From a paper:
Inside the sperm axoneme, a pair of microtubule singlets termed as central pair complex (CPC) are surrounded by 9 microtubule doublets (DMTs), forming a “9 + 2” architecture. The dynein motors are responsible for driving sperm movement and fine-tuning motility, while the MIPs provide the major stabilizing force for the DMT architecture.
Here, by in situ cryo-electron tomography, we solved the in-cell structure of mouse sperm DMT at 4.5–7.5 Å resolutions, and built its model with 36 kinds of MIPs in 48 nm periodicity. The A-tubule was resolved at an overall resolution of 4.5 Å with the local resolution up to 3.6 Å in DMTF16, and an overall resolution of ~6.5 Å in DMTF48. The B-tubule was resolved at an overall resolution of 6.5 Å in DMTF16 and 7.5 Å in DMTF48. We identified multiple copies of Tektin5 that reinforce Tektin bundle, and multiple MIPs with different periodicities that anchor the Tektin bundle to tubulin wall. The junction sites of Tektin5 filaments are dispersedly distributed in each 48 nm repeat but interleaved with the junction sites of Tektin1 to Tektin4 filaments, which may further stabilize the DMT architecture. The Tektin bundle is linked to the tubulin wall by several buffer proteins, like EFHC1/EFHC2, MNS1 and NME7 with different periodicities, to reinforce the stability of tubulin wall. However, in the DMT structure of mouse sperm axoneme, we observed that SPACA9 forms a pattern of 5-3-3-4-4-4 in each 48 nm repeat, and SPACA9s are located between the protofilaments B02 to B07, B02 to B05, and B02 to B06, respectively. In this dataset, the “9 + 2” architecture of the sperm axoneme is compressed along the electron illumination direction, possibly due to the surface tension applied to the sperm tail during blotting. By analyzing the cryo-EM maps of DMTW48 and DMTF48, in addition to the different widths, 432 Å for DMTW48 and 443 Å for DMTF48, we further found that the A-tubule in the deform specimen (DMTW48) shows a similar structure as that in the intact specimen (DMTF48), while the densities of B-tubule in the deformed one (DMTW48) are significantly averaged out. However, in the B-tubule, we observed a substantial loss of density in both the tubulin walls and MIPs within the DMTW48 map, including CFAP20, PACRG, SPACA9, and CFAP52.
Residue numbers in the entry:
A (entry chain CH), E (entry chain DF): 1 to 427
B (entry chain G5): 251 to 400
C (entry chain H3): 210 to 240
D (entry chain DE): 1 to 438
């Protein structure tokens, strides 16, 4: 049977797996101790897509955690579910990254790739047959970009036949906090576009806007935002676990999703975002869902695809729905914006229906999109790269590491090619 | 355990000794709050807050971080009782996120603290470590006394 | 006395009386 | 079983011994009267003392030693001390006349009529003991009576007994300090005589012992009591294997078989790492690493020698106290990785480790620290030849002008023997670079 | 009946045996006083193979304890089970070793060989029919190698028809403590290769690593370190004492292990080694046993056979298993690393399954290995022996005892002979 091994990298990958995993454990009803509390047979039939078995009714997660700063792990370990996490799974380092990509890609990665490869192959042999792997990290996160680029490059040759699912958060457009972050991102995306097959794109001001727009609660914790995106990651994975006539395999989703190889960067979409009075002011109907589904405000990925057009779109519906409402909703929306799609391909909606609602809500959904709205993202970073490479600011470090400006030349040359690549197909 | 009177919060650490065969991490718990019972059903985060604003007139333009029109009724408050200072006495039942635990000793000030709080005074130590068994003694072989007795 | 006169912080560069006469021991005891 | 006999020649080597049984009686809890409390350890004399004391049916712990001296003053004084009832009267072999700092006078004029009696002492101690691993000799090179008298007795105990060990402990002559100008005379007379008979001669120097006192022990005005206490601790550490046990137990026979490379040279260096004050131990911590760094620090040896001017041959360390091999073998491995450390390529391994669980004890009225982990570091190196190099250029001057010869030739000696020692010495240096040359 | 009489030699075997017999005692359930507490019939059945009964329900261990130093022997008699050891079987000497090989081989042995031969033949007549003997000692041990080389020679002619099982520990490669130990080891191995049939090779450095790897308790005791190894030979002896569908005789095993006479050096291998929380974090399954069972980190004997190749391999399985999982595991490992074995012999695996698990754990196994990894060991001693012989350091002792350099000539020459022979067979 086909299972999945998870990778959490970077200190946001450390953020995310914690919230991502507890939602899953809470979803299936396992206590923090590990003694599963049997209530649903359907969650009792597909735990081995993600979890292996331990003695005493314990479900061992098949995730490998890697970082450098122990206090992150100590917080991660001392959390609600660190006991369900393995000290076996805790691989780390003796140095501080300095949040330097070159360090994490050449210097400390050199002596840590051996450990993680042994850990993953031990875990790979622990399980039978894989769909693939997913990685939670950041493209602008220096440790996450450091190991991830190495790891995704490594996992390719041993297993070039599986899913290289990637989950990276796009840094803040207005202020990157880290000033060398644009340098870090440009380096990674060069290898990322080459090594990956699928990419998740996430931004926090969109989440911050969502926090303002519908959450309406002024001050959340970053974990609350982590819950929002973990729900997105849950929904896309609920497809594989749950029964109901919907085609779940990521390949099944991917081959319907990507017409040309260079398309890996895709944007999410989620299901009812509800404010304080509107939980009991809402008549949860597929129309008002579908209305809220295709809301540019309900978007959370990067920025409005209003600027561009829609290449491929795929939505999965979770709950007690039927084939007809989803069908007419497309028949509605398709006529609503017929021109906003590309004349290249018609009938670009990819629909799957999960009959198993989440715990606490009946009619939910998820959306994954590939529209012509990524240009400004790497166009934004293009001016940043050109300006700081114009006078090579903050460059003396990477030269001391052993890097050179030539690497930057092909890196931007590739990205500029992706600019035309995206521009030419739509425009 | 470490209950904090400034935030009404608790903390748990471990006293594992040498050769314990256990990690060096001390704080087995966060410094947060302990729900009165086992794992609470996750209340669909996205409404797990305290205050209730009603409408935002901010998105109209950009002056501040938008306008916050509050409410007056504050509905949707879901009940989350927490382990407060009330249930503190030597010998009790507590479920720590799934840990059915007991209570047997207090440090130094709780004595003074508890007398002041309501009126209580009877504080006695209770053994929580396992009882010990001795190594008995030795005997000696039967003797025929073939020669000197000693 | 102040803080400690019984023993005064060995390496104590300031002098003490009784630098002569009864000697032949460690720091603290003579002080 | 496991026992030895200890010998003390010259009033120099007697106060240094007095402390050690004072010391040795402390960890054993020996009351000055001569008996234990109502607690039961007496019997046929077989307990922790059976290697050190002779607590026979009389119940009195009798030390297995003979003090030999030529001037009654000091030996009478200790005979009026506190543990005088413990000591055997005529084991405290005294004399009425001195050796006049003369090597030969104590070796010829008086030693003949006294050796017979001490020969009677040793045999009557030889018969009672069973294991008799060897002997413990405290002496000195610049000895007015220690030098000459020990030389003859060592010759006599060698010829009748050549199957057991002889451990020689002496204060080495101070390199730049000389309380007597005839000290080089008798000193080389000892060396050339002892080169072909002595088994293991270990040395120490008082100046560096004093240097330690006001460096880390922070004592600008110590006394003999503390120096005697320090060396008494040193011999206590090496004898701790005899008393207690450990992870592994080692014996002096292993020490001899595993330290000396070749005949003649049998002169390593001793060092004790945790030499610190009480308050220093009070607010600090001790572990194998720093003390291993401490024992190998060039200023901590009691011999004015720089190992970087020599090369390392052997190293024997006696870890006494609470310790595990893990950090020990890791720490010494780092020591092997060190580049400044200069062993000869002849020995890939040179480390003789001894583990003892018993924590070293403090002494009442003492100045040491509260040690849990301790080591005596026994090492031999090639940076030692400068000591005899200092001696010869010192000696060759006075010999050419033959000072004080009338004193020795007056009492019946001649020059040929003085002639022997110089090439006997010159043999010693030339060997040292030959073994020094890889 | 077919039985075994043990020999406790060298001061290490003094710790080896002390832990070894108490491991025998508690597994069978006898109190320290010696009054067996009747709990298991099978252990009650198969206790005669090593023990004899005296009056009053007391099993006498059938071994001989030999030393020279009373105090070490004092420590063990004062040990928790010194009462179950015989003052009759305590033989020793009035002399000190000096940690000298020659003294215990010609001087000290001469007056002690007579008595020890009497005791063993008294013990030999006490029993009916022995399979053979096993000896705990060290090759680099001062008196143990001194006594062992003598006794192994003498036991050859008296009973040339039995099992001359030998158990010796290899000193630490980084440091031998004893500096004349290379002389001591080289002297011993010259006669060891001549007389022995089976030899176990053990090194504390890898054992020191094991504490850092799975014990994870920083500061162990060498007795606990004995506790590690005491499990090893106990496992191979469980096959003899325990029932179940598996062949027990070492001759059944040794002929399966030894293709050519000069093969006597064999390496142990143990099964699940568990850490802090992995007891309740491990799902005990034959696959996960097997992978850890074949781990270079699980190797404890000398060093990594990664540098070399595998001649013969044998793992005995203790617990409730079946013939099919072990069969597929052998098939799995066969396909995994087929080139790493020798093309000389295919199907070089020998497996036995003991149905009686240990006391406390259910799934367990023990491995004996004869791979091509011993080369590095005796090249190490090769340069060690030559360099100290290049200027005959520390030699005046042995000439004084009566030993001559001619003895050293053939000892290394035969050692050099084993170098090529192990090399030639594999390379
Ligand atoms: N844990 C945590 N991470 C955050 C938070 N907000 C943003 N992040 C981001 O998560 C990113 C990725 O984490 P890592 O890949 O582990 O970062 P790194 O390589 O260790 O180094 P830096 O990114 O420079 O901190 C960081 O760059 C942060 O910018 C937050 O609130 N909590
Ligand atoms: N061993 C020892 N030596 C000391 C002591 N105090 C000083 N010394 C030094 O040791 C030397 C003693 O040697 P000698 O004077 O020849 O002693 P002796 O041969 O027994 O005969 P005397 O000259 O009468 O003392 C002196 O030169 C001092 O420098 C001490 O307490 N013990
Ligand atoms: N008992 C014991 N032996 C150890 C230990 N660690 C290392 N060994 C070695 O095991 C070897 C075997 O001991 P024996 O054969 O009895 O030694 P011996 O013949 O009495 O003489 P030596 O080897 O010099 O001690 C010794 O040489 C030690 O080097 C330990 O912790 N306990």
């Amino acid at each position: 049977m086909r299972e999945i091994v998870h990778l959490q990298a970077g200190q946001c990958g450390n953020q995310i797996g914690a919230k991502f995993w507890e939602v899953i454990s809470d979803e299936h009803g396992i206590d923090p101790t590990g003694t599963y509390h049997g209530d649903s047979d359907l969650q009792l039939e597909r735990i081995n897509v993600y979890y292996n078995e331990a003695t005493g009714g314990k479900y061992v997660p098949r995730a490998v955690l890697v970082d450098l700063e122990p206090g992150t792990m100590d917080s991660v370990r001392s959390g609600p579910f660190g006991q369900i996490f393995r000290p076996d799974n805790f691989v780390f380092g003796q140095s501080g990254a300095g949040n330097n990509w070159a360090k994490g890609h050449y210097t400390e990665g050199a002596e840590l790739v051996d450990s993680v490869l042994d850990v993953v192959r031990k875990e790979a042999e622990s399980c039978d047959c894989l769909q693939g792997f997913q990685l939670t990290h950041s493209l602008g996160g220096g440790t996450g970009s450091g190991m991830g680029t190495l790891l995704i490059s490594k996992i390719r040759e041993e297993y070039p036949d599986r899913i290289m699912n990637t989950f990276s958060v796009v840094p803040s457009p207005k202020v990157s906090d880290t000033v060398v972050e644009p340098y870090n991102a440009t380096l990674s995306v060069h290898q990322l576009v080459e090594n990956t097959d699928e990419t998740y794109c996430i931004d926090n001001e969109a989440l911050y806007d969502i926090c303002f727009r519908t959450l309406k609660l002024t001050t959340p914790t970053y974990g609350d935002l982590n819950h929002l995106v973990s729900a997105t990651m849950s929904g896309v994975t609920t497809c594989l676990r749950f029964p109901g006539q919907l085609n779940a395999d990521l390949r099944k989703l991917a081959v319907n999703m990507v017409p040309f190889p260079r398309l890996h960067f895709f944007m999410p979409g989620f299901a009812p975002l509800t404010s304080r009075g509107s939980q009991q002011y809402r008549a949860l109907t597929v129309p008002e869902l579908t209305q809220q589904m295709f809301d540019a405000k309900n978007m959370m990925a990067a920025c409005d695809p209003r600027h561009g057009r829609y290449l491929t779109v795929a939505a999965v519906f979770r709950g007690r729905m039927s084939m007809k409402e989803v069908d007419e909703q497309m028949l509605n929306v398709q006529n609503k914006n017929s021109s906003y799609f590309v004349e290249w391909i018609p009938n670009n909606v990819k629909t799957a229906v999960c009959d198993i609602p989440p715990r606490g809500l009946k009619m939910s959904a998820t959306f994954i999109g590939n529209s012509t709205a990524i240009q400004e993202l790497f166009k934004r970073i293009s001016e940043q790269f050109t300006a700081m490479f114009r006078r090579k600011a903050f460059l003396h470090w990477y030269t001391g590491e052993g890097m050179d400006e030539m690497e930057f030349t092909e890196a931007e040359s590739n990205m500029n090619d992706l600019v035309s690549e995206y521009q030419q197909y739509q425009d | 355990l470490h209950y904090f009177l400034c935030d009404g919060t608790v903390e748990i650490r471990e006293v594992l000794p040498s050769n314990s065969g256990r990690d060096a991490m001390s704080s087995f718990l966060r410094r947060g709050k302990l729900p009165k019972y086992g794992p609470p059903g996750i209340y669909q985060p996205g409404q797990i807050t305290d205050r209730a604003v009603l409408n935002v007139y901010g998105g109209l333009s950009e002056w501040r971080a938008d306008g916050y029109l509050l409410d007056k009724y504050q509905l949707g408050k879901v009940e989350q009782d927490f382990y407060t200072d009330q249930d503190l006495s030597i010998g009790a039942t507590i479920n720590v996120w799934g840990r059915k635990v007991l209570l047997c000793d207090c440090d130094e000030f709780t004595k003074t603290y508890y007398r002041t709080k309501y009126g209580v005074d009877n504080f006695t130590p209770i053994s929580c470590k396992p009882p010990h068994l001795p190594k008995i003694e030795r005997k000696y072989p039967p003797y025929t006394g073939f020669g000197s007795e000693e | 006395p102040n803080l400690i006169q019984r023993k005064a912080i060995s390496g104590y560069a300031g002098f003490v009386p009784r630098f002569a006469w009864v000697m032949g021991m460690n720091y603290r005891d003579g002080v | 079983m496991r026992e030895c006999i200890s010998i003390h020649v010259g009033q120099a080597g007697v106060q240094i011994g007095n402390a050690c049984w004072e010391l040795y009686c402390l960890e054993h809890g020996i009351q000055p009267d001569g008996q234990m409390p109502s607690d039961k350890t007496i019997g046929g004399g077989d307990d922790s003392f059976n290697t050190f004391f002779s607590e026979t049916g009389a119940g009195k712990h009798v030390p297995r030693a003979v003090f030999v001296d030529l001037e009654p003053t000091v030996v009478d004084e200790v005979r009026t001390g506190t543990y005088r009832q413990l000591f055997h009267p005529e084991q405290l072999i005294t004399g009425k006349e001195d050796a006049a700092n003369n090597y030969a006078r104590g070796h010829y004029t008086i030693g003949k009529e006294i050796v017979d009696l001490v020969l009677d002492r040793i045999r009557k101690l030889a018969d009672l003991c069973t294991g008799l691993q060897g002997f413990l000799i405290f002496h000195s090179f610049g000895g007015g009576t220690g030098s000459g008298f020990a030389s003859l007795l060592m010759e006599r105990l060698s010829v009748d007994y050549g199957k057991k060990s002889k451990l020689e402990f002496a204060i080495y002559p101070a390199p730049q300090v000389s309380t007597a100008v005839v000290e080089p005379y008798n000193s080389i007379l000892t060396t050339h005589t002892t080169l072909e008979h002595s088994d293991c001669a270990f040395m120490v120097d008082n100046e560096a012992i004093y240097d330690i006192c006001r460096r880390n022990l922070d004592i600008e005005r110590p006394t003999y009591t503390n120096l005697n206490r320090l060396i008494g601790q040193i011999v206590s550490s090496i004898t701790a294997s005899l008393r207690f046990d450990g992870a592994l137990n080692v014996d002096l026979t292993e020490f001899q078989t595993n330290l000396v490379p070749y005949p003649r040279i049998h002169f390593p260096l001793a060092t004790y790492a945790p030499v610190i004050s009480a308050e220093k131990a009070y607010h600090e911590q001790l572990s194998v690493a720093e003390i291993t760094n401490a024992c190998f620090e060039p200023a901590n040896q009691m011999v004015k020698c720089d190992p970087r001017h020599g090369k390392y041959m052997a190293c024997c360390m006696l870890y006494r106290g609470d310790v595990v091999p893990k950090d020990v073998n890791a720490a010494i491995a780092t020591i092997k990785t060190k580049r400044t450390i200069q062993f000869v390529d002849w020995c890939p391994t040179g480390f003789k480790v001894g583990i003892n669980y018993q924590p070293p004890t403090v002494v009442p009225g003492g100045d040491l620290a509260k040690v849990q982990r301790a080591v005596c570091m026994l090492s031999n190196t090639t940076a030692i030849a400068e000591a005899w190099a200092r001696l010869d250029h010192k000696f060759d001057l006075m010999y050419a002008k033959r000072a004080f010869v009338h004193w020795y030739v007056g009492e019946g000696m001649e020059e040929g023997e003085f002639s022997e020692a110089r090439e006997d010495l010159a043999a010693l240096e030339k060997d040292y670079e030959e073994v020094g040359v890889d």
